[PDB]
Design a protein around this ligand. Sequence first.
Ligand SMILES: Nc1ncnc2c1ncn2[C@@H]1O[C@H](CSCC[C@H](N)C(=O)O)[C@@H](O)[C@H]1O
Lengths: 128, 35, 17, 199, 416, 54
Amino acid sequence: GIQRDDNGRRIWRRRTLTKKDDMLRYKLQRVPFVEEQVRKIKEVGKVMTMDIERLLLSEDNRFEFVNSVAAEATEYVEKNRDEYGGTKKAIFHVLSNRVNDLGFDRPEAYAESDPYKPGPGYLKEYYT
Amino acid sequence: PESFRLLVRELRSLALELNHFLVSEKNFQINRKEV
Amino acid sequence: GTGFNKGDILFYHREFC
Amino acid sequence: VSALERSLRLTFMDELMERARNRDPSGVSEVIYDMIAAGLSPGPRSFHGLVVAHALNGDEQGAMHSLRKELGAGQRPLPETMIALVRLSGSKGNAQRGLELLAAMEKLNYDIRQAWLILVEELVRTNHLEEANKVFLKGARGGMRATDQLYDLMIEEDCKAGDHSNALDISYEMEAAGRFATTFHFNCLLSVQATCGIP
Amino acid sequence: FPLFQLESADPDFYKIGYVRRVRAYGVEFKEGPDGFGIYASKDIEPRRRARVIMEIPHELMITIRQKHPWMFFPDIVPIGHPIFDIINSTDPERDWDLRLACLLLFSFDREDHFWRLYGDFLPAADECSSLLLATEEDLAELQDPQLVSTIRQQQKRVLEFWEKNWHSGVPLKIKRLAEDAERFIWAVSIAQTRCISMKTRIGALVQDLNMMIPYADMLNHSFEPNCFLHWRPKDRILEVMSNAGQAIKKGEEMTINYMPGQKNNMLMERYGFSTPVNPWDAIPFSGDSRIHLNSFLSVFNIFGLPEEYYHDSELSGDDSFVDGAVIAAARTLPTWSDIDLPPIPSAERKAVKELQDECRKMLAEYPTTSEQDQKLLDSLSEARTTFATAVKYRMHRKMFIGKIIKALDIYQERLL
Amino acid sequence: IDQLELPPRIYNCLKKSNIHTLLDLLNNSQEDLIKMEHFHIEDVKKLLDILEKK
Ligand SMILES: Nc1ncnc2c1ncn2[C@@H]1O[C@H](CSCC[C@H](N)C(=O)O)[C@@H](O)[C@H]1O
């Protein structure tokens, strides 16, 4: 097992696949043309939808999950009243905090803004 | 609630009383709710 | 649903120095 | 530390610890002044012998005064020294002093879980169940997890006294900590629920 | 300005799991002369809750029920296969490792099974540290007759099972699993050293399982782990979670507690390794001389109840001395306690001296010392893995007894 | 970078990589410049010296 040659450096057998996995070729690839789709997914708020499903996989009962989130949200508003109700929503803050607690990274309260707004007074108009 | 408080009065017109009691799970004391 | 199952010593006792 | 200093400390601490165990707070005071005369500085373990000697003779005021001497000398009391004072406070039913000392241990950055357990059993043993419940709930609601033996002690003693409100509060905290109630604990609550006239 | 300013495992090791939904977060698999390990590839910052380190899908595991009847999750053994009869003929209590070994060898024979690929990263017969692979000369270096007899019984039990079930008349689909006894012994060694037992819920069925879990059997053991395993029933994923609130530095090894409360001889019998800082290791004292338990704990800042002893590392600053060995010393030394009675220093010195003499009497039972064993390991060039494991075991026990003599010396002086 | 006295081989490499200004060159590390073809380690010191002298 333990082998040292001449100069005291231990020499050892590096473990390798030494076998063929056909799943390696056809699965570690990528589609190149989803930039528009990715940007709309974030725009419509679909990312938090996946995060909610992620959090519910760690929960035994979805009704106690709902109650716990509301309880945590109530605590945020009492602690800092003026920071919530506009661009930052307390329930959205709770959900993003709970995703970050798992070690993943999300923007605070999923809040994002349009960088191409042509100054104050201008509202983006939605094409139904 | 106004829907239930109004119901109690209409039942009182028929000589029936409808009391709501809360039994404490801690000390078992009965509280009559103001209806 | 969500309604189921009810939803100072050591102060003023320091070294004079 | 020289060899001469170590030799004197051994014989000074031999005499001091032989009078603390003799339940003689007065003698433990004489040796400390002997140490001061010799120039030796009384450390945390010399004032521990003074606290213990007073504590063993049921003397809460002298033991508290000894702790003030230790703090006034700039020494840091040992975790065992605080536990001796906390256990003494419970034996006299002084829950306020016992809670004040627990706050000091947190300030001294010690671990108050063991001293909190000792405080609660002393109050229960000395028939201060009402005070014991106040101290136990504060620790349990504060996040500390009690021992399984103390959980079974608090629930049973409250239910023997007809105190369902405290026994139900504790059993809720026992499960929140992570210890699920068994048939024994339920039988304690039922012993009181069966006499309330509401089946 | 930016212009003016342990080898990584085979890349295919993670990839074969990754294409089958294995996820690792902030960790990397690194290989060294002593084997694989999992290390933080970056600074893992503390959070309010436990962070997900690894996710392993259930379908990549080999699991069997701990308790009779033997059901496999996922069920890979066909109905009527002769391997089930071999698994079913085992002792329900003692032969859990034989049952897992049969499943493991059967899995290597399946073309679609993941462990056909994952098996190439398992230690070979000359690289596994299990004492089932140890020769009689390797057991001679243990210097522990009780452990040696335990291993010999294990080797006898494993061999007799192979001879009974892999005789000449068995079908070819059975013969090709374990063509030789050493192949079956190796499988049992893999089963013992890598099996993870947990209580899981699968669907609506809650049961205890013995599990072979890839990429989580690469976590090394620590009695102060920074990670723990968590079964996620909803999607059938084993989670490796770092401790909540614990900061993990880049390059730090990720560890779990294989066997809480177990001594080094138990770690040697099961996993073929020992630790010098095992907080549960015991030493046989006469009990004639006793020290003050409360003083010893406070001198070294050991807090908590006896079953949860821990070192308040923030109350010592830089005292590297206190570790699991001193905690083990607190549990194994003869102690007295009288509520709040203080100890007389002169009477405690006599006990400390007598305890140190008894500690040196035990070190004198060993023909060599712990330094001479340490340099023997450095001088090795053609030693079996189990030989070095046997030497590390006896050296760790010597290092433990030596730590007790050092701790008693510190305690005796700090009692002034 | 046109106004630094860089050798023509170095200049063509930086322009090929769309490094135009002094600030663009600074933000590039020493490993990235080696990644560029025809620009090697022997060229770092002479380029650093020109920026050292500047
Ligand atoms: N703390 C530790 N000290 C020494 N060896 C350890 C160890 N923790 C785990 N091991 C080794 O790792 C084995 C468990 S499997 C853990 C990963 C292993 N190195 C592998 O290649 O798969 C044990 O047999 C033991 O030999």
